[PDB]
């Protein structure tokens, strides 16, 4: 009878590096999808299961909210079947993903004069990641380093500015 804390997700002060992306499980509660459907603070809102029209906690047993920050061009990689650096090495969705990708421009929050070296992404990897697999390793090679910083600064073009991404997976199993 108590509410689903999407606010803790979307309105979080800090967001994860995509390589070490964050996943929050939404257990028994009720929150409204159409709230965000109308929110229109959102530049990318694509769903693969079904239109957000269910209006309740209608017919759902577990909801996984993945969030992280990638750069602006990279958002088109948060989809079934993409193959770039983010899809290959940092965050891969299943081909039969059913869920919503939600992205929105965070230039004003995550960019920094001088450049925000906090946010990071993995650049090489021996093999691709299976979908929802994760890699937080920081092993120097032999001797060169596998993570790189975006270093967002707010004069970069929208292709390079930070984007905050929320990926909502939907479990039915029960």
């Amino acid at each position, epitope marked *: 009878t108590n509410l689903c804390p999407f606010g803790e997700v979307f309105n979080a*002060t800090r967001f994860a*590096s995509v390589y070490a992306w964050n996943r929050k499980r939404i257990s028994n509660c009720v929150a409204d999808y159409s709230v965000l459907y109308n929110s229109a603070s959102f530049s990318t809102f694509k769903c693969y299961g079904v239109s957000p029209t269910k209006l309740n906690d209608l017919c759902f047993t577990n909801v996984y909210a993945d969030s992280f920050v990638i750069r602006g061009d990279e958002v088109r990689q948060i989809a079934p079947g993409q193959t770039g650096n983010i899809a290959d090495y940092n965050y891969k969705l299943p081909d039969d993903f059913t869920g919503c990708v939600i992205a929105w421009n965070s230039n004003n929050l995550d960019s920094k004069v001088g450049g925000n*070296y*906090n946010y990071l992404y993995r650049l090489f990897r021996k093999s691709n990641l299976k979908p929802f697999e994760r890699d937080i390793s*920081t092993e120097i090679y032999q001797c060169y*380093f596998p993570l790189q910083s975006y270093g967002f600064q707010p004069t970069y073009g929208v292709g390079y500015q930070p984007y905050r991404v929320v990926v909502l997976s939907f479990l039915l199993l029960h």
Partner: antibody
Amino acid sequence: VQLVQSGAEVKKPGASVKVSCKASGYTFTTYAMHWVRQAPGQRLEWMGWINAGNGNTKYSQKFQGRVTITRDTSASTAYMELSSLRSEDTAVYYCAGGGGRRLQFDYFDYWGQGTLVTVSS
Amino acid sequence: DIQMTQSPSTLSASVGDRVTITCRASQSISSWLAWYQQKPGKAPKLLIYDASSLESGVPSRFSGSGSGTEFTLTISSLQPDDFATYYCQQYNGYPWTFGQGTKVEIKR
């Protein structure tokens, strides 16, 4: 997580000072390490930082080309060196850093004891 | 270059008082703000980061607040070892910069 710096030095103007800051109990290998000084009874100044991984440095313009931050990964020690001192530089010199699990270069989690450096003729 | 000016430069108070320093900024820093405690002859200690997050094992009586351009550091009830100077520091900009501080001294 324990940061222990190098005693205290005093040198002539135009010389240089190297200050080490050995740091122990860090669970990971990639964390930020800043240097920030305190002139007598004055404001705290941020000077710069290095990355504990790739060794990258971001310096404050106020000292650019005057300071140099080395990171000696093997002996888990961070070095700061300021050259051609102008006696505006008498201060205590702390090494800060932190974030640990989550990287951040934003704010300072653990501080060294402070090392005091005097510039005079 | 971003300037921080903390409002009561000195502050007398007694143990048990509620105590509220203030920190203000040239620009807005939206929430990228840390508070520090410093006692004479000792290095600073982190207290609050991202304006409200209470650093680990710092007593709950400290509490940060404020977004954008004006920020506060309440102390719900003062204890003897809270007598120190307190700084703020922005991490929205570059050079990171601190305020001048607030010595919080014993009312007499």
